[PDB]
Amino acid sequence: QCFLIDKNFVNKAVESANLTKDDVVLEIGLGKGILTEELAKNAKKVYVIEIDKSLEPYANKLKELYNNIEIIWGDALKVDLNKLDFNKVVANLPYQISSPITFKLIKRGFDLAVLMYQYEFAKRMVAAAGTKDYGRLSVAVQSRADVEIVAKVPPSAFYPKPKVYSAIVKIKPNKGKYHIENENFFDDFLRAIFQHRNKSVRKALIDSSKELNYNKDEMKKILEDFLNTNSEIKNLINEKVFKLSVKDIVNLSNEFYRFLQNR
Numbered sequence: 001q002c003f004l005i006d007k008n009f010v011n012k013a014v015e016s017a018n019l020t021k022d023d024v025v026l027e028i029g030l031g032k033g034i035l036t037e038e039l040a041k042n043a044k045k046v047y048v049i050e051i052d053k054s055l056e057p058y059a060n061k062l063k064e065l066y067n068n069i070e071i072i073w074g075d076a077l078k079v080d081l082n083k084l085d086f087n088k089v090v091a092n093l094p095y096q097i098s099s100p101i102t103f104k105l106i107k108r109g110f111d112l113a114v115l116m117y118q119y120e121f122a123k124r125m126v127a128a129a130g131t132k133d134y135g136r137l138s139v140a141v142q143s144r145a146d147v148e149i150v151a152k153v154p155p156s157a158f159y160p161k162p163k164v165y166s167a168i169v170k171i172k173p174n175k176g177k178y179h180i181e182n183e184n185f186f187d188d189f190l191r192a193i194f195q196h197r198n199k200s201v202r203k204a205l206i207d208s209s210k211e212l213n214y215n216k217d218e219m220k221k222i223l224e225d226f227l228n229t230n231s232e233i234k235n236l237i238n239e240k241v242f243k244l245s246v247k248d249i250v251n252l253s254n255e256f257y258r259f260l261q262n263r
């Protein structure tokens, strides 16, 4: 485990979280408890989910100085987050859980999260439409939250030093900006189209038709009919998947959902 040791990066994360004594913070991963201490100083209460009980002496040290820290010994991917009353999340994430934890957290909901990821993952999360790093992850996150990289974090900020840079990412859920009609269909639609990111949406959907439970012939005919509904749809489905904006992918998928349900 590469512990975050550089207090300057702890400070940047904590600052980005805009904490007050009315906030309740979830942290994932205890590490040395440096970040934990700063959270406890500034927030009402902090929950820490930590899988490795050999880190208990760090927990015990903290609990001597702070009365507002609760340690949950367990797997963050398994814990029922619905049962905890946090409004913010601040963590140097265990990188291996980056994707599922992000969506688990977003599903549960929060006012704001400030999370450290490996740099390449963060770049993908925030990537602009039509760029090399833009993909399913980018749209999956940006359709649900405003995201931005707060700071790049060098290997030297950790001990032992990792092989790659990390990045602090601020995530602010934003449900009403894009308004997903049906989350499960949206998820299936994203999966299908990003299996062929350099093809037109139309051709991607045909190739991946089985991801939406249609055979290739069915899907071809569906899209013929769909394209005839209006000129905007025609223009969207003929563009390359990775070139459509998040707004356009959300609206296209919403329209397609409504189309299929009507049919």
Ligand SMILES: Nc1ncnc2c1ncn2[C@@H]1O[C@H](COP(=O)(O)O)[C@@H](O)[C@H]1O
Pocket: 001, 002, 028, 029, 030, 031, 049, 050, 051, 052, 074, 075, 076, 077, 093, 094, 095, 096, 097
């Ligand atoms: N799924 C998990 N839930 C809670 N804590 C974890 C989980 N996975 C790893 N950790 C802890 O987070 C620390 C950072 O993860 P890692 O740097 O990927 O080894 C590790 O030392 C573990 O103690």
